[PDB]
């Protein structure tokens, strides 16, 4: 996260760290959507241009964390993956269209003050909140600049008008993406950055006071560049896919 602040303890209890077994390192962010399911960006698991194709056994999820590098004894829980599912029409060749994956955990994770799932939006929560000007929240342990943070970082960013998103870049933007960030005039800044991918863009519903995951940190052109924005996977648009995988392979 570029130009954020330290998370408060328990502020993002659905935040998951995607951690490489060997070498020991952070791969990406992720989010906890139930006791055995974790949501991330497909490109955190599968991105051929960089020779990346992880299997279940290459990876761990670390849930309940605040510190990046510390083993948070009595606080975090570390889980092994039973199965990875990448969206069958994830477009890693062109523009990261449908940058979404699910990870079924080997065992249920226990909830706590520090571990708790986020909601996924329904049609109406999306229609209502996915509006230009409305701010969401992005958290992760990624680079602080285009060094690295001691603890989980947070930034609140405005959703941006779609023609403005499109006119910031040469990449073809699809309906499965939205962009967020402040404009050059606005004074305020901030963006996700490397290692933040797969993490959640969330919003707190003013109606039922619940946090919903509206986006997944997908891509940017640099980090916190003026005239450039972060691009997020439109989670509600892929929820039929989410629901299929879970109805079929969940218990």
């Amino acid at each position: 996260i570029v130009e954020g602040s330290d998370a408060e303890i328990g502020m993002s209890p659905w935040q998951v760290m995607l951690f490489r077994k060997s070498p020991q390192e952070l791969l990406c962010g992720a989010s906890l959507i139930s006791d055995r399911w974790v949501l991330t960006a497909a490109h955190c698991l599968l991105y051929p241009p960089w020779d990346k194709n992880f299997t279940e056994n290459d990876l761990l999820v670390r849930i309940g964390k605040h510190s990046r590098t510390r083993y948070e004894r009595n606080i975090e829980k570390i889980s092994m993956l039973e199965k990875i599912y990448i969206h069958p029409r994830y477009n890693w060749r062109e523009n990261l269209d449908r940058d979404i994956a699910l990870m079924k955990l080997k065992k249920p994770v226990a909830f706590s003050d520090y571990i708790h799932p986020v909601c996924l939006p329904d049609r109406e929560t999306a229609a209502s909140l996915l509006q230009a000007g409305y701010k969401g929240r992005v958290t992760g342990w990624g680079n602080l600049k285009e060094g690295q943070p001691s603890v989980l970082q947070v930034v609140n960013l405005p959703i941006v008008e779609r023609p403005v998103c499109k006119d910031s870049t040469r990449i073809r933007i699809t309906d499965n993406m939205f962009c967020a960030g402040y404009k050059p005039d606005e004074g305020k800044r901030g963006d996700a950055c490397e290692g933040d991918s797969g993490g959640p863009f969330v919003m707190k519903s003013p109606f039922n006071n619940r946090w919903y995951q509206m986006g997944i940190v997908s891509w940017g052109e640099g980090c916190d560049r003026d005239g450039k924005y972060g691009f997020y996977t439109h989670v509600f648009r892929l929820k039929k896919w989410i629901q299929k995988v879970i109805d079929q392979f969940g218990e």
């Binding site: 951690f19 020991q24 390192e25 761990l60 510390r70 083993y71 092994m80």
Partner: peptide, 10 residues
């Protein structure tokens, strides 16, 4: 750079 995690998880 990362603190070693319990071996049980590997």
């Amino acid at each position: 750079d990362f603190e070693e995690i319990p071996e049980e998880y590997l």
